[PDB]
Every structure is written in C-alpha cells, then in structure tokens.
C-alpha cells in the first residue's frame, strides 16, 4: 500500500504492514541552510533513539509485535476481541486509552524487572 496507506483500515488489517513504517523513521558552512540540515539530522537521531530506548527496558528490543506477561485490566476497556480489531482503527483506539497510558507504561517497566537473576548467583 505504501507509507501510511493503511490509515483508514481497521486494527486487524493495519497490523500486518508494520515493516513499511518500520524503515522510514530514520532516513557544510554556517549559513542559513547549513544549520537547518544539521538540526534536522540531530532531531532525526533524537526522535529515533528516544523511541528505541523505551523498547529496551521492556524486553522487546528488535521485535515489531512483542507481547509480555502483563494482565490486561477490565477497567481500561470493556470491549471484546471483535469490536476492536474489526471495527475500531488506530486513530480511535488511542483516544480511549489516553487516561490509562502511563499506568501501562509503568507496569511494563517492572515486568522485565521481576524477571532478573536472584540468588541463583549465590
């Protein structure tokens, strides 16, 4: 389909072309056009390393579809598995979980934590 071609489809049809968007988030004097290119390159490095640092603390580094052992609470969404992937899209699902995003982001940090070496070291 192309870059951002599945924006109008549902969540079940847009979760299969993640490799298209997974390769377009990264790519001499002091004049007025020489500093803007350096600013754009530094911003492109910053907007990629910050997004890649979040996947390293969750244990999903190098995976596009990664799922963990965090139980989904029933108070975040009261929908089934058919009214989300077949009816709602990604532009409407983000508006409903905006008040519970930081809770999931904090619960995902300790998961990859309660799974570290203990005494087994002795």
């Amino acid at each position, epitope marked *: 389909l192309g870059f951002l071609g599945a924006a109008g489809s549902t969540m079940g049809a847009a979760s299969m072309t993640l490799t298209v968007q997974a390769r377009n988030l990264l790519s001499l004097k002091l004049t007025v056009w020489g500093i803007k290119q350096l600013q754009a390159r530094v911003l492109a490095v910053e907007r990629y390393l910050r997004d890649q640092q979040l996947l390293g603390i969750w244990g999903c580094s190098g995976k596009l579809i990664c799922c963990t052992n965090v139980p989904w609470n029933s108070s*975040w969404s009261n929908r089934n598995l058919s009214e989300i992937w077949d009816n709602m899209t990604w532009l409407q699902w983000d508006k409903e979980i905006s008040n519970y995003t930081q809770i999931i982001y904090g619960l995902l940090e300790e998961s990859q934590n309660q799974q570290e070496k203990n005494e087994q070291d002795l």
Partner: antibody, heavy 132, light 108 residues
C-alpha cells in the same frame, strides 16, 4: 467572542409549522463547527433533538421524519444562520429551544466522540407555546 | 441507551460548606465521556467540567470532578451565593446523548 441570538417568543396552533432561527457571531465556517438543536420542557429535564456536523444533518430516533435542520455558510453581508422547521406539532411541544455550537477542529480535543459531542457555547432560548 | 441517575434530588447548604453530587450510569463508561452543566433559573445552561475532571476556560478552581467505574462525583468547595441553581450530568459515549434529572441547591 461568539454570541448567539435566536427569534422571539411566538404562539402557535395545533396543525401549523414552526420555524426557529439561530444566528452566531464569531463563527467563520460551519465546516470546523457543529450545530446542535435541543429542547427543554418547563419542569422536566433536557432532551436532544438534532444536530448538523460536517454538512450532514441528523436527528435522534424519536424525531425522525418530523423536524428539518438546515444551515448556510458565511454570506458576505449576513452572519451564518441555522433554521429548524417543525411540521404538524402536537399540543405537548410548549418548551424552550436551544441552539448550541461545538468546535470540531482538533481531533484530540476530547469534546467530541464520533459525532456525539458536548455543548460548549449556548444560545438564548426560544419559548414556543401551542394552544387552542 | 444509558440512563443517568443523579443523587441527591434536593439538598440545602450554606456559604462555606462543600456540595457533593453523584451521577451513576447504566453501563460502564471506561473512556470517561461525561460532562457537568449548571443552570440558573431564568438564564442559559453553562458547561463547567468536561471529560471527567478537565476544567473549562473561565471556570474557577473551586469546582472539582472525579470518575471511578460508573460513579461520577462533582465536588463544590467554598460555596458562594452565585452557585445556587440546577446541576446536570450528561454522557456522550454512545448515540444519542442523555442528560440527568436535576439537582436543586438551596440556601440554608
């Protein structure tokens, strides 16, 4: 600042047609906004009648085929108006009618959910009384 | 359809006390689609708090809201002589919208 005005207080008879106008100062186009027509009976709660949004007019399941909502954009010598027509009214329609606007410009504004939205700016209120 | 139930029906307070008004929906609203309106007798209604606990431009900080499951609570601290009216809780989760029943606040 947006200011809304409506028509005056009028009386009616059972079997006629009612036309209520709603003018708004401050709105440039009706594409970035949505208009809602509600009513309130004296002594009861509020009731949602109809709306128009994205140049699409609709109503609830209780007033289907009875009312008609129309609107016009920015005329160069007049404010944009909105008209509500009620045909063949019954003797339980004596109420205060309200015309509200809601800004639908931002997608993440939180004031609208797929057409179903809240009311931010309220009008004046037209008192409609029907008797024999 | 969602049937909003407001509590209590009729209360009375004075200047200084806090007023707590509860609103209970029929189903579960997980997205926090609720709004609170006030109306003086004779004037037009006015929106105060939209989407659970977000304030509007011009509303003072003495009004607060909270959402928990199907319970939406509205708290008014430091009550003045210009807040005695009728309050309503309205949901906008599903189509169409439904208002409450009203809460008359009188002076004691």
């Amino acid at each position: 600042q947006i200011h809304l005005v409506q028509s005056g207080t009028e009386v009616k008879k059972p079997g006629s047609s009612v036309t209520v106008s709603c003018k708004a100062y401050g709105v440039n186009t009706f594409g970035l906004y949505a208009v809602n027509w509600v009513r309130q009976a004296p002594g009861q709660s509020l009731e949602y009648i109809g709306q128009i949004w994205r140049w699409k007019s609709s109503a609830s399941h209780h007033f289907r085929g009875r009312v008609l909502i129309s609107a016009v954009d920015l005329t160069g010598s007049s404010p944009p108006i909105s008209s509500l027509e009620i045909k063949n009214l019954t003797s339980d329609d004596t109420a205060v009618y309200f015309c509200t606007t809601t800004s639908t410009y931002d997608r993440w504004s939180g004031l609208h959910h797929d057409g179903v939205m809240a009311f931010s700016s309220w009008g004046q209120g037209t008192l409609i009384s029907v008797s024999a | 359809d969602i049937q909003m139930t407001q509590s209590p029906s009729t209360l009375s307070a004075s200047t200084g006390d806090t007023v707590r008004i509860s609103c209970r929906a029929s189903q579960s609203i997980t997205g926090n689609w609720v709004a609170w309106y006030q109306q003086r007798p004779g004037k037009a209604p006015r929106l105060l708090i939209y989407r659970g606990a977000a304030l509007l431009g011009g509303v003072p900080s003495r009004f607060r809201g909270s959402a928990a499951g199907t319970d939406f609570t509205l708290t008014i601290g430091n009550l003045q002589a210009e807040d005695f009216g009728t309050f309503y809780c309205q949901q906008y989760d599903t189509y169409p919208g439904t208002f409450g029943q009203g809460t008359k606040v009188e002076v004691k």
